[PDB]
Design a binder for this molecule. Structure first.
Ligand SMILES: O=S(=O)(NCCNCc1ccccc1B(O)O)c1cccc2cnccc12
Ligand SMILES: *[C@@H]1OC[C@@H](O)[C@@H](O)[C@H]1O
Ligand SMILES: [Cl-]
Lengths: 18, 353
């Protein structure tokens, strides 16, 4: 599922600016 | 047509009243923009309590004003680190913006000062924690819950854009929840006062508009794209474009093939297709009717914009607050000492602070 892909992406924590 | 005479006259009057408000707001902003405040307190006026959040050139600490006992959030920036990361102009501009703006959903700068090693911005303490925390705790927000937050961002961007400010770092991590359940926007490190187009590659990958990624210039409509990303993430629990690595996120953004959870309402999908619009000539917030295309969209039909502004709407989530200085709604961070060098650092670079 899309949610499962989100978990697997590793980008579920706080995101830094570039 | 869609409106009878009474509804049409009411909406017209409301829109003209916004114009009148923004004209006065701009006059007030510009006075402070041209004559910023400086050096309104000093470090030994405060007790350092606990770290609330961290970055690469500073940290934010809960502090207590010794004389009055009031709590504040003090951002501490290491001048040498700011120079090293080429963040001088960003940090001066952030403080200049914060001391000049005034809006109920923008965090207020109560004091600012500097010493030999650091810059200090003492802001109101917003004790409910980050929207990020609550969103990840609950999974996703129902559409009325998401709409309540979204309406505050819409008003806040309407205000900022009238001042020619582009915000450029919207995300749940940058939105704090106050004791009444309303939003506070905090971090102006990438905001710019721009009349027209600009080019800087900045922001956070998931929230970048296609035209930021691509070399073409861009304007304030990047903030309306980012609003689309925020609303999507609030209502889905995940953003519309993600991948393992930012370069792969950028590829998905520039395609712009957005897909929606099956629980999204049709009104929500229509709004998001008009905000997450790659074509600038079609993106809501960037057309002839401006912000009114967003505020008048069916998904906001139940939103009483003045009541939101007046903070008279009951919020969907009221944070637990066990008293003054309670940090139960924040993550824990490692605590380092705050050292003040005997020798002044980077004095000339930070004269304006
Ligand atoms: O430390 S912060 O949460 N930092 C801002 C929110 N989190 C920023 C962030 C942290 C990590 C990654 C991306 C973004 C913060 C800052 C400014 C004023 C505050 C007032 N009351 C509480 C906290 C405050
Ligand atoms: C935050 O960082 C990304 C991923 O490791 C997540 O599980 C959190 O640790
Ligand atoms: Cl994190």
């Amino acid at each position: 599922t899309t949610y499962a892909d989100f978990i697997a992406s590793g980008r579920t924590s706080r995101r830094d600016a570039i | 047509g869609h409106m009878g005479n009474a509804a049409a006259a009411k909406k017209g009057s409301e829109q003209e009243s916004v114009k009148e408000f923004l004209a006065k707001a701009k006059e007030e902003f510009l006075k402070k923009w041209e004559s910023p405040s400086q050096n309104t307190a000093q470090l030994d006026h405060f007790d350092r309590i606990k770290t609330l959040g961290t970055g690469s050139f500073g940290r934010v600490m809960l502090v207590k004003h010794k004389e009055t006992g009031n709590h504040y959030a003090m951002k501490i920036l290491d001048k040498q680190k700011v120079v090293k990361l080429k963040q001088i102009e960003h940090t001066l501009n952030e403080k200049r913006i914060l001391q000049a703006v005034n809006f109920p959903f923008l965090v207020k700068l109560e004091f600012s000062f500097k010493d030999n090693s650091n810059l200090y911005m003492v802001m109101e303490y917003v004790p409910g924690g980050e929207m990020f925390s609550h969103l990840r705790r609950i999974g996703r927000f129902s559409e009325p819950h998401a709409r309540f937050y979204a309406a505050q961002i819409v008003l806040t961007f309407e205000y900022l854009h009238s001042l020619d400010l582009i915000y450029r770092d919207l995300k749940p991590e940058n939105l704090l929840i106050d004791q009444q359940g309303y939003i506070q926007v905090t971090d102006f490190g990438f905001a710019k006062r721009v009349k027209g187009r600009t080019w800087t590659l900045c922001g956070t990958p998931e929230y970048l508009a296609p035209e930021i990624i691509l070399s073409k210039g861009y304007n304030k409509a990047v903030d309306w794209w980012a609003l689309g990303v925020l609303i999507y993430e609030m209502a889905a629990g995940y953003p519309p474009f993600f991948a393992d690595q930012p370069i792969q996120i950028y590829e998905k953004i520039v395609s712009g093939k957005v897909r929606f959870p099956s629980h999204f309402s049709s009104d929500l999908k229509d709004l998001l297709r008009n905000l997450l619009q790659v074509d600038l000539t079609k993106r809501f917030g960037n057309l002839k009717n401006g912000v009114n295309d967003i505020k008048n969209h069916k998904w906001f039909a139940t939103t009483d914009w003045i009541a939101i502004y007046q903070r008279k709407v009951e919020a969907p989530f009221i944070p637990k607050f066990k008293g003054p200085g309670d940090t139960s709604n924040f993550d824990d961070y490692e605590e380092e000492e705050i050292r003040v060098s005997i020798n002044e650092k980077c004095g000339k670079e930070f004269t304006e602070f």
